[PDB]
Design an enzyme around this catalytic site. Structure first.
Site, mmCIF file in Angstrom:
data_model
loop_
_atom_site.group_PDB
_atom_site.id
_atom_site.type_symbol
_atom_site.label_atom_id
_atom_site.label_comp_id
_atom_site.label_asym_id
_atom_site.label_seq_id
_atom_site.Cartn_x
_atom_site.Cartn_y
_atom_site.Cartn_z
ATOM 1 N N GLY A 1 6.725 2.319 6.722
ATOM 2 C CA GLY A 1 6.012 1.451 7.604
ATOM 3 C C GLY A 1 5.647 2.646 8.577
ATOM 4 O O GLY A 1 5.526 3.700 8.274
ATOM 5 N N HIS B 1 9.712 26.862 7.997
ATOM 6 C CA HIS B 1 10.969 27.562 8.246
ATOM 7 C C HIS B 1 11.621 26.983 9.372
ATOM 8 O O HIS B 1 10.917 26.941 10.407
ATOM 9 C CB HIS B 1 11.113 28.968 7.991
ATOM 10 N N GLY C 1 -4.363 11.871 15.157
ATOM 11 C CA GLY C 1 -5.096 12.531 13.804
ATOM 12 C C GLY C 1 -5.854 13.679 14.418
ATOM 13 O O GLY C 1 -6.606 13.688 15.204
ATOM 14 N N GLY D 1 0.828 -1.167 0.002
ATOM 15 C CA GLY D 1 0.013 -0.015 -0.031
ATOM 16 C C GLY D 1 0.865 1.221 0.012
ATOM 17 O O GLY D 1 0.716 2.016 -0.859
ATOM 18 N N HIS D 2 1.866 1.239 1.062
ATOM 19 C CA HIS D 2 2.696 2.275 1.067
ATOM 20 C C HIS D 2 3.894 2.055 -0.083
ATOM 21 O O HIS D 2 4.482 2.745 -0.824
ATOM 22 C CB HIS D 2 3.418 2.355 2.275
#
Lengths: 193, 193, 193
Positions: free
Chosen positions: A52, A121, A169, A10-11
């Protein structure tokens, strides 16, 4: 850069897309932990670790390096990186789609910057950290090693996050740490019918 | 693609901009429900539905299709779409400014992907759904038909949202559903002077 | 546009990057409040104010204007701006990396639009306001003068924010104001070990 790439993962699909966006013509998928000691007999095309999981990333990174491969950065061509930013060269760093890294930021080795994340920055992002989709670090933020910033999370300016920390999240970090910790947002609440 | 476009439809202006960003030279605005049965006498330039509102989108989509027009997708040239993503062809899909759709994602028919939204690898976004400004779906998320994801909302990986559901502005979905529902965030609270 | 630029001013570095992204070949850094009355003896290259702080921006803007310099906009080449949007010409406006400004939006004079912020169709953003990293205004939002929208904040459609208001990091504005105010989100909460 080499013309083919080994991708460990998937990754993995998303890493294939970034590699092809850069000039790569062929991606070769490996996902064999134990066969890795023999892989040194293979042609030395560029390598990437599409895990991962910080920390399998890190382990496998070290095994693949010690087997004579170069582990490159994958940077999609969309990413905007200040000429004064430091991205560790050939260090298994993934830079997604629409990432921005501004002046004098530092990205170390095997960081994941996921799609549309923003590194402002003078950030440091420590080794094997994962800044996920749409996560944003304001100016002068210090993310430690093996940290996770969840989807759509953010960190206010001038703050440090200690090694091994998790930002949930949709959460907003507002305070300096030095101690590792875990750092939750609010939960959309189902309204009752 | 045709050289002029009929645009049925604020969201109309934004659709005009996307059409012009693609090669279109002229946009023709229609906003006449009852005159629609006569519109079949017109030259068959490409069509787009700049509503809404899922569900007027859907109704008018069906009436315009049955009148012999092609309802195209409008995809701004900024959007990054994996070659393995599936965007339903000629299906009234709007893809804004700086949208990203990653590997093997599926976008069905008359979806709105609003500006800077992100659809991660292996998402489905169901028919006539509205993913609004800056909303982000993590990997393997399943959005049902006629759903609304509010501004700056997000959905954690591997989750499903059932048909007809509403995710409020700034909310984070954390749990699988199968039942339809509505799914609120926190409210900036005025601090008292 | 002139070939060198004076930059008055961390935010200075980021402004240097945007200027160089546009065609500028040399940036000249000034940070001298009291020497400013003599600066009128200098060659009239373009000027930019890389503060702040609304409101030092504003003060110094006025002193530099009255000394015979042109204070230009700095717009990075990544920004997507609708041809029908109004960006006040030569008005010390900074437009970051991956900003989107959609149809008929208005940006007045010495606004900061920080990286990946989004200004939707038909917004006004009032003079000397600061829309920070990843902050998003939905359609038809009215931001007053000298406002601050914190990192990853958003404003729901059709809303007005009164002059001199602060929207905290990660906060979602849900209600019309006319009175000035300050407008906080939730705080990632350290989970206890």
């Amino acid at each position: 850069r080499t013309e083919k790439i080994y991708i460990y993962g998937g990754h993995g699909l998303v890493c294939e897309d970034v590699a092809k966006n850069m000039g790569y013509k062929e991606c070769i998928f490996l996902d064999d932990f134990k066969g890795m000691k023999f892989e040194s007999t293979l042609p030395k095309y560029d390598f990437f670790i599409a895990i991962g999981n910080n920390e399998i990333r890190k382990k496998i990174y070290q095994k693949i390096s010690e087997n004579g491969f170069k582990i490159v950065n994958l940077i999609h061509k969309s990413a905007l990186i200040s000429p004064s930013a430091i991205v560790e060269e050939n260090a298994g760093i993934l830079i997604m789609p629409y990432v921005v890294i501004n002046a004098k930021a530092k990205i170390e080795k095997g960081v994941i910057l996921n799609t549309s994340s923003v590194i402002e920055h003078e950030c440091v992002i420590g080794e094997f950290s994962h800044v996920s989709v749409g996560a944003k670090c304001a100016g002068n933020v210090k993310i430690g090693k093996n940290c996770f910033l969840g989807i759509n999370s953010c960190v206010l300016p001038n703050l440090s996050l200690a090694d091994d920390s998790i930002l949930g999240g949709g959460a907003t970090l507002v305070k300096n740490q030095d101690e590792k910790g875990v750092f939750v947002g609010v939960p959309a609440k189902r309204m009752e019918g």
